[PDB]
Amino acid sequence: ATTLKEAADGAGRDFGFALDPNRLSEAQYKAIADSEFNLVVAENAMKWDATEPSQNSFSFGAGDRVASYAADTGKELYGHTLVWHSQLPDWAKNLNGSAFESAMVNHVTKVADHFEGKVASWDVVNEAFADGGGRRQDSAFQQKLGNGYIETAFRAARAADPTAKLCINDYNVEGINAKSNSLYDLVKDFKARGVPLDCVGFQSHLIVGQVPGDFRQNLQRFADLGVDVRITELDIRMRTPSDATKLATQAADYKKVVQACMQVTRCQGVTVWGITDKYSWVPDVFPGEGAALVWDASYAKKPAYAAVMEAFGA
Numbered sequence: 001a002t003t004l005k006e007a008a009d010g011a012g013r014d015f016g017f018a019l020d021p022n023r024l025s026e027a028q029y030k031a032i033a034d035s036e037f038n039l040v041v042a043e044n045a046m047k048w049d050a051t052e053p054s055q056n057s058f059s060f061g062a063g064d065r066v067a068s069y070a071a072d073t074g075k076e077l078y079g080h081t082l083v084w085h086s087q088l089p090d091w092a093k094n095l096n097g098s099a100f101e102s103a104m105v106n107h108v109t110k111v112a113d114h115f116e117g118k119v120a121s122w123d124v125v126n127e128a129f130a131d132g133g134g135r136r137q138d139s140a141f142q143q144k145l146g147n148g149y150i151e152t153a154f155r156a157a158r159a160a161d162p163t164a165k166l167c168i169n170d171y172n173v174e175g176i177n178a179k180s181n182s183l184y185d186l187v188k189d190f191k192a193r194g195v196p197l198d199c200v201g202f203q204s205h206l207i208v209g210q211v212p213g214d215f216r217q218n219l220q221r222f223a224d225l226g227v228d229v230r231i232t233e234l235d236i237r238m239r240t241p242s243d244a245t246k247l248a249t250q251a252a253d254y255k256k257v258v259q260a261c262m263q264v265t266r267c268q269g270v271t272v273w274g275i276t277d278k279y280s281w282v283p284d285v286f287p288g289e290g291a292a293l294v295w296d297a298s299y300a301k302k303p304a305y306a307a308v309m310e311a312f313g314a
């Protein structure tokens with residue numbers, strides 16, 4: 001292999017990136033997108049704010065651009081995300097009771113129908129759980145609809161799209177902890193009762209030098225419930241600026257994550273949350289942190305690149 005795409009292809013797994021379709025007009029960004037990944041997810045273009053800016057009025061141009069990119073380059077398309085407490089328009093927050101439930105159901109139905117046969121897998125529900133266990137405490141869905149909204153969303157997604165893989169996705173669930181235990185309980189319950197659910201996403205927004213040692217064990221216990229697993233939003237952030245020590249640790253960390261996936265037969269692959277440090281979401285949220293991705297801000301491969309290639313078995 002001479003590319004990460006070749007390494008993942010050869011391993012029989014997915015290696016994906018989060019796309020901003022506006023950056024396709026930057027040729028260096030597009031060149032790396034085209035050659036280094038076999039899967040694409042929309043970083044933002046398929047979220048609720050980007051797709052349904054007023055009630056039952058849809059704006060699919062940006063999401064269509066991502067889908068067309070996937071089809072034109074022969075990449076798998078991953079859908080992110082139907083139901084999420086963040087990036088939720090005010091019009092939806094202003095609804096309550098059955099009117100809010102109906103807005104959720106309609107959003108799920110219209111977006112899944114629109115992309116049916118193009119999107120292969122959906123994050124149907126994103127970030128439902130709380131650090132420390134139990135349900136998220138600042139969610140319009142949890143607050144307005146209670147526990148049952150997750151099952152409602154999954155059943156509605158399956159009613160719209162009979163074949164797509166339907167995933168639940170979360171962060172800080174890479175290790176075995178109260179949060180991943182709550183997620184595990186739900187997955188086991190859904191499978192037991194025949195609620196549509198095919199996959200679990202592990203965002204893997206990690207900090208340099210802090211990869212959970214029980215990541216593989218955790219992925220495996222989920223796979224053993226009868227679902228696929230995936231690393232969905234990988235990045236590994238450090239204090240900026242980078243130096244040799246930090247870049248070496250980061251490379252080792254990327255290798256640990258990709259190896260954990262390789263070691264679980266039903267781990268579909270790894271998606272990184274962007275291409276270049278130039279555009280990473282990290283510095284805006286975490287002051288003085290960054291350099292989290294595989295390419296630096298001038299599109300040079302970082303040591304993480306060779307580590308990913310090695311971990312895929314190339």
Ligand SMILES: O[C@@H]1[C@@H](O)[C@H](S[C@@H]2CO[C@@H](S[C@@H]3CO[C@@H](S[C@@H]4CO[C@@H](O)[C@H](O)[C@H]4O)[C@H](O)[C@H]3O)[C@H](O)[C@H]2O)OC[C@H]1O
Nearest residue numbers: 043044049050086087127171203205233273280281282285
């Ligand atoms: O105006 C919008 C603008 O809001 C967005 S900016 C957008 C935000 O979403 C990020 S993806 C990011 C990834 O991490 C997860 S989990 C996160 C991990 O660290 C924890 O301690 C944090 O508290 C958690 O939130 C986040 O939930 C998720 O938001 C995108 O990459 C950014 O682009 O852009 C579009 C504009 O129209």
